[PDB]
Design a protein around this ligand. Structure first.
Ligand code: MET
Ligand code: MET
Ligand SMILES: [Zn+2]
Ligand SMILES: [Zn+2]
Lengths: 152, 151
Protein backbone atom coordinates (compact mmCIF):
# COMPACT_ATOMS: atom_id res chain seq x y z
CA UNK A 1 0.00 0.00 0.00
CA UNK A 2 1.10 3.59 -0.28
CA UNK A 3 1.28 5.37 3.04
CA UNK A 4 0.13 8.93 3.54
CA UNK A 5 3.62 9.87 4.71
CA UNK A 6 6.64 9.46 2.44
CA UNK A 7 9.08 8.02 4.96
CA UNK A 8 6.59 5.31 5.99
CA UNK A 9 7.19 3.94 2.48
CA UNK A 10 10.95 3.63 3.00
CA UNK A 11 12.13 0.18 4.14
CA UNK A 12 14.25 1.21 7.12
CA UNK A 13 15.86 -2.24 7.42
CA UNK A 14 17.63 -1.90 4.03
CA UNK A 15 19.24 1.52 4.08
CA UNK A 16 22.84 1.91 5.16
CA UNK A 17 23.47 4.89 7.41
CA UNK A 18 24.90 7.46 7.12
CA UNK A 19 23.33 8.81 3.96
CA UNK A 20 21.55 11.68 2.17
CA UNK A 21 18.39 10.55 0.42
CA UNK A 22 16.10 12.42 -1.96
CA UNK A 23 13.00 11.79 0.15
CA UNK A 24 10.50 13.81 -1.84
CA UNK A 25 9.94 16.23 -4.71
CA UNK A 26 6.88 18.42 -4.81
CA UNK A 27 6.28 20.86 -7.60
CA UNK A 28 3.79 23.59 -6.78
CA UNK A 29 0.86 24.53 -9.03
CA UNK A 30 3.03 27.46 -10.22
CA UNK A 31 5.98 25.24 -11.08
CA UNK A 32 8.23 25.99 -8.11
CA UNK A 33 10.01 22.86 -6.92
CA UNK A 34 10.31 21.84 -3.25
CA UNK A 35 12.73 19.02 -2.50
CA UNK A 36 13.11 17.15 0.76
CA UNK A 37 16.22 15.26 1.87
CA UNK A 38 16.48 12.57 4.53
CA UNK A 39 19.95 13.08 5.96
CA UNK A 40 20.34 10.02 8.16
CA UNK A 41 23.08 10.04 10.81
CA UNK A 42 22.33 6.78 12.66
CA UNK A 43 21.26 3.31 11.46
CA UNK A 44 17.49 2.80 11.97
CA UNK A 45 16.72 0.79 15.13
CA UNK A 46 20.39 0.14 15.67
CA UNK A 47 21.46 3.49 17.08
CA UNK A 48 20.37 7.08 17.69
CA UNK A 49 21.42 10.60 18.77
CA UNK A 50 20.95 11.66 22.40
CA UNK A 51 18.70 14.72 22.57
CA UNK A 52 21.27 17.25 23.78
CA UNK A 53 23.62 16.56 20.84
CA UNK A 54 20.69 16.27 18.41
CA UNK A 55 19.26 19.55 19.69
CA UNK A 56 22.55 21.39 19.32
CA UNK A 57 23.41 20.03 15.89
CA UNK A 58 19.97 21.34 14.87
CA UNK A 59 20.77 24.91 15.96
CA UNK A 60 24.27 24.77 14.46
CA UNK A 61 23.37 23.31 11.07
CA UNK A 62 20.15 25.35 10.82
CA UNK A 63 22.11 28.55 11.32
CA UNK A 64 25.22 27.59 9.33
CA UNK A 65 23.76 25.92 6.25
CA UNK A 66 21.97 29.19 5.52
CA UNK A 67 25.39 30.91 5.20
CA UNK A 68 26.28 28.58 2.35
CA UNK A 69 22.84 28.43 0.69
CA UNK A 70 20.05 30.90 -0.08
CA UNK A 71 17.50 28.16 -0.85
CA UNK A 72 17.02 26.36 2.45
CA UNK A 73 13.43 26.18 3.70
CA UNK A 74 13.91 24.02 6.78
CA UNK A 75 16.23 21.76 8.82
CA UNK A 76 14.29 19.66 11.35
CA UNK A 77 15.23 16.65 13.45
CA UNK A 78 13.30 13.41 13.12
CA UNK A 79 11.34 12.20 16.12
CA UNK A 80 13.15 8.87 15.77
CA UNK A 81 16.39 10.68 16.65
CA UNK A 82 18.28 9.05 13.78
CA UNK A 83 18.32 11.92 11.34
CA UNK A 84 17.14 15.25 10.02
CA UNK A 85 14.98 16.46 7.15
CA UNK A 86 16.33 19.25 4.96
CA UNK A 87 13.87 21.12 2.78
CA UNK A 88 14.89 23.36 -0.11
CA UNK A 89 12.94 25.37 -2.71
CA UNK A 90 13.88 25.93 -6.36
CA UNK A 91 17.08 23.82 -6.20
CA UNK A 92 17.58 20.41 -7.69
CA UNK A 93 21.23 19.32 -7.97
CA UNK A 94 21.87 16.44 -5.58
CA UNK A 95 25.66 16.90 -5.71
CA UNK A 96 25.51 20.57 -4.68
CA UNK A 97 23.47 19.52 -1.63
CA UNK A 98 26.23 17.15 -0.54
CA UNK A 99 28.81 19.95 -0.91
CA UNK A 100 26.64 22.36 1.03
CA UNK A 101 26.23 19.78 3.81
CA UNK A 102 29.96 19.07 3.71
CA UNK A 103 30.91 22.75 4.05
CA UNK A 104 28.28 23.01 6.76
CA UNK A 105 29.55 20.09 8.81
CA UNK A 106 33.07 21.46 8.60
CA UNK A 107 31.98 24.82 10.08
CA UNK A 108 30.15 23.00 12.86
CA UNK A 109 33.52 21.59 13.99
CA UNK A 110 35.09 25.08 13.97
CA UNK A 111 32.19 26.35 16.08
CA UNK A 112 33.00 27.83 19.49
CA UNK A 113 29.43 27.87 20.71
CA UNK A 114 25.88 26.70 20.01
CA UNK A 115 23.82 29.59 18.44
CA UNK A 116 20.86 31.06 20.26
CA UNK A 117 21.27 28.65 23.17
CA UNK A 118 19.54 30.72 25.88
CA UNK A 119 15.98 31.07 27.18
CA UNK A 120 15.14 33.96 24.86
CA UNK A 121 15.77 32.05 21.64
CA UNK A 122 15.15 28.43 22.63
CA UNK A 123 12.48 26.31 24.32
CA UNK A 124 14.95 24.24 26.33
CA UNK A 125 18.16 26.30 26.44
CA UNK A 126 19.66 24.05 29.09
CA UNK A 127 19.48 20.86 26.98
CA UNK A 128 22.52 21.57 24.80
CA UNK A 129 26.05 20.36 24.06
CA UNK A 130 28.61 21.54 21.54
CA UNK A 131 30.90 18.52 21.98
CA UNK A 132 28.21 15.93 21.28
CA UNK A 133 26.97 17.93 18.31
CA UNK A 134 30.48 18.19 16.95
CA UNK A 135 31.00 14.48 17.65
CA UNK A 136 27.96 13.73 15.49
CA UNK A 137 29.15 16.04 12.71
CA UNK A 138 32.68 14.57 12.66
CA UNK A 139 31.35 10.99 12.49
CA UNK A 140 28.92 11.98 9.71
CA UNK A 141 31.86 13.69 7.94
CA UNK A 142 34.20 10.70 8.30
CA UNK A 143 31.93 8.74 5.92
CA UNK A 144 31.42 11.50 3.38
CA UNK A 145 32.33 9.06 0.60
CA UNK A 146 29.26 6.91 1.45
CA UNK A 147 26.71 9.76 1.51
CA UNK A 148 25.00 8.98 -1.80
CA UNK A 149 24.90 5.26 -1.05
CA UNK A 150 21.43 4.98 0.53
CA UNK A 151 21.41 1.21 0.27
CA UNK A 152 17.89 0.92 -1.14
CA UNK B 1 21.16 40.33 16.65
CA UNK B 2 18.99 38.76 13.94
CA UNK B 3 19.86 35.08 13.40
CA UNK B 4 19.55 33.24 10.09
CA UNK B 5 16.94 31.02 11.76
CA UNK B 6 13.58 32.76 12.34
CA UNK B 7 12.60 31.03 15.59
CA UNK B 8 15.81 32.38 17.14
CA UNK B 9 14.25 35.82 16.59
CA UNK B 10 11.15 34.96 18.65
CA UNK B 11 11.27 36.09 22.28
CA UNK B 12 10.51 32.80 24.05
CA UNK B 13 10.14 34.55 27.40
CA UNK B 14 7.08 36.46 26.18
CA UNK B 15 4.97 33.72 24.61
CA UNK B 16 2.42 31.56 26.37
CA UNK B 17 1.94 27.92 25.37
CA UNK B 18 -0.13 26.31 24.05
CA UNK B 19 -0.52 28.24 20.79
CA UNK B 20 -0.33 28.11 16.97
CA UNK B 21 1.84 30.87 15.51
CA UNK B 22 2.45 32.05 11.93
CA UNK B 23 6.21 31.53 12.06
CA UNK B 24 7.45 31.95 8.52
CA UNK B 25 6.67 32.55 4.86
CA UNK B 26 8.66 31.95 1.69
CA UNK B 27 7.75 32.32 -1.97
CA UNK B 28 9.35 30.57 -4.91
CA UNK B 29 10.47 32.47 -7.99
CA UNK B 30 7.32 31.23 -9.77
CA UNK B 31 4.80 32.35 -7.14
CA UNK B 32 4.34 29.27 -4.95
CA UNK B 33 3.79 30.00 -1.25
CA UNK B 34 5.14 28.17 1.77
CA UNK B 35 3.90 29.00 5.28
CA UNK B 36 5.41 27.46 8.40
CA UNK B 37 3.49 27.38 11.67
CA UNK B 38 4.95 27.21 15.19
CA UNK B 39 2.52 24.93 17.05
CA UNK B 40 3.71 25.09 20.67
CA UNK B 41 2.53 22.42 23.13
CA UNK B 42 4.73 23.34 26.09
CA UNK B 43 5.79 26.53 27.87
CA UNK B 44 9.41 27.25 26.81
CA UNK B 45 12.03 26.43 29.44
CA UNK B 46 9.26 25.60 31.92
CA UNK B 47 8.11 22.26 30.52
CA UNK B 48 8.67 19.77 27.67
CA UNK B 49 7.35 16.61 25.98
CA UNK B 50 8.97 13.23 26.65
CA UNK B 51 10.40 11.71 23.47
CA UNK B 52 8.25 8.58 23.23
CA UNK B 53 5.05 10.61 23.42
CA UNK B 54 6.48 13.23 21.06
CA UNK B 55 7.64 10.55 18.62
CA UNK B 56 4.21 8.91 18.59
CA UNK B 57 2.47 12.26 18.12
CA UNK B 58 4.80 13.00 15.17
CA UNK B 59 3.61 9.79 13.48
CA UNK B 60 -0.10 10.19 14.35
CA UNK B 61 -0.60 13.80 13.35
CA UNK B 62 1.66 13.43 10.27
CA UNK B 63 -0.64 10.75 8.86
CA UNK B 64 -3.92 12.00 10.31
CA UNK B 65 -3.50 15.61 9.26
CA UNK B 66 -2.94 14.63 5.59
CA UNK B 67 -6.27 12.75 5.70
CA UNK B 68 -7.77 16.22 6.31
CA UNK B 69 -5.66 18.37 3.99
CA UNK B 70 -3.77 17.79 0.83
CA UNK B 71 -1.50 20.84 1.17
CA UNK B 72 0.74 19.73 4.09
CA UNK B 73 4.40 19.72 3.21
CA UNK B 74 5.68 18.59 6.57
CA UNK B 75 4.89 17.95 10.29
CA UNK B 76 8.14 18.13 12.29
CA UNK B 77 9.05 17.99 16.02
CA UNK B 78 11.31 20.74 17.41
CA UNK B 79 14.68 19.87 18.94
CA UNK B 80 13.63 21.65 22.14
CA UNK B 81 10.70 19.27 22.71
CA UNK B 82 8.05 21.97 23.27
CA UNK B 83 6.30 22.02 19.90
CA UNK B 84 6.15 21.08 16.22
CA UNK B 85 6.54 22.86 12.92
CA UNK B 86 3.70 22.64 10.43
CA UNK B 87 4.67 23.54 6.88
CA UNK B 88 2.08 24.12 4.15
CA UNK B 89 2.10 24.75 0.38
CA UNK B 90 -0.14 27.26 -1.41
CA UNK B 91 -2.45 27.61 1.60
CA UNK B 92 -2.71 30.92 3.42
CA UNK B 93 -5.73 30.55 5.70
CA UNK B 94 -4.94 30.73 9.43
CA UNK B 95 -8.52 29.92 10.51
CA UNK B 96 -8.60 26.68 8.48
CA UNK B 97 -5.28 25.66 10.02
CA UNK B 98 -6.76 25.89 13.51
CA UNK B 99 -9.81 23.80 12.49
CA UNK B 100 -7.71 21.13 10.73
CA UNK B 101 -5.53 20.98 13.83
CA UNK B 102 -8.70 20.72 15.91
CA UNK B 103 -10.03 17.84 13.78
CA UNK B 104 -6.61 16.14 13.69
CA UNK B 105 -6.20 16.18 17.47
CA UNK B 106 -9.70 14.73 17.85
CA UNK B 107 -8.96 11.80 15.50
CA UNK B 108 -5.68 11.21 17.36
CA UNK B 109 -7.81 10.43 20.43
CA UNK B 110 -9.73 7.79 18.44
CA UNK B 111 -6.52 6.17 17.10
CA UNK B 112 -5.98 2.53 18.02
CA UNK B 113 -2.26 2.31 17.19
CA UNK B 114 0.59 4.67 16.48
CA UNK B 115 0.85 4.20 12.71
CA UNK B 116 4.12 2.88 11.35
CA UNK B 117 5.61 2.11 14.76
CA UNK B 118 7.66 -0.83 13.45
CA UNK B 119 11.28 -1.39 12.31
CA UNK B 120 10.44 -1.29 8.62
CA UNK B 121 8.83 2.16 8.68
CA UNK B 122 10.41 3.88 11.68
CA UNK B 123 13.99 4.60 12.74
CA UNK B 124 13.35 3.84 16.45
CA UNK B 125 10.28 1.58 16.50
CA UNK B 126 10.49 0.69 20.19
CA UNK B 127 10.36 4.35 21.30
CA UNK B 128 6.61 4.98 21.18
CA UNK B 129 3.46 5.28 23.29
CA UNK B 130 -0.07 5.77 21.95
CA UNK B 131 -1.41 6.81 25.34
CA UNK B 132 1.41 9.30 25.82
CA UNK B 133 0.63 10.88 22.45
CA UNK B 134 -3.09 10.92 23.21
CA UNK B 135 -2.37 12.70 26.53
CA UNK B 136 -0.57 15.53 24.72
CA UNK B 137 -3.40 15.61 22.20
CA UNK B 138 -6.05 15.88 24.92
CA UNK B 139 -4.26 18.64 26.86
CA UNK B 140 -3.59 20.63 23.67
CA UNK B 141 -7.25 20.26 22.82
CA UNK B 142 -8.58 21.32 26.25
CA UNK B 143 -6.89 24.71 25.76
CA UNK B 144 -8.26 25.16 22.23
CA UNK B 145 -9.74 28.64 22.90
CA UNK B 146 -6.19 29.84 23.62
CA UNK B 147 -4.56 28.69 20.38
CA UNK B 148 -4.73 32.10 18.73
CA UNK B 149 -3.22 33.98 21.67
CA UNK B 150 0.57 33.68 21.42
CA UNK B 151 1.60 36.58 23.67
C1 MET C 1 15.34 25.79 16.27
S1 MET C 1 16.54 25.60 14.94
C2 MET C 1 15.52 26.05 13.52
C3 MET C 1 14.71 24.86 13.08
C4 MET C 1 13.74 25.14 11.94
N1 MET C 1 13.09 23.86 11.53
C5 MET C 1 14.46 25.85 10.78
O1 MET C 1 15.28 25.20 10.09
O2 MET C 1 14.19 27.05 10.57
C1 MET D 1 7.97 10.19 10.93
S1 MET D 1 6.41 10.98 10.57
C2 MET D 1 6.86 12.00 9.14
C3 MET D 1 7.34 13.36 9.53
C4 MET D 1 7.69 14.29 8.37
N1 MET D 1 8.10 15.61 8.92
C5 MET D 1 6.50 14.44 7.41
O1 MET D 1 5.70 15.37 7.61
O2 MET D 1 6.38 13.64 6.47
ZN1 LIG E 1 16.52 25.10 20.82
ZN1 LIG F 1 9.33 7.01 13.86
Amino acid sequence: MKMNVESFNLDHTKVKAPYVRIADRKKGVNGDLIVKYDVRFKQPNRDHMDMPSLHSLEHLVAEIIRNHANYVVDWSPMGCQTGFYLTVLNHDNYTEILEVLEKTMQDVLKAKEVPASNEKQCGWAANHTLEGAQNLARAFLDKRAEWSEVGV
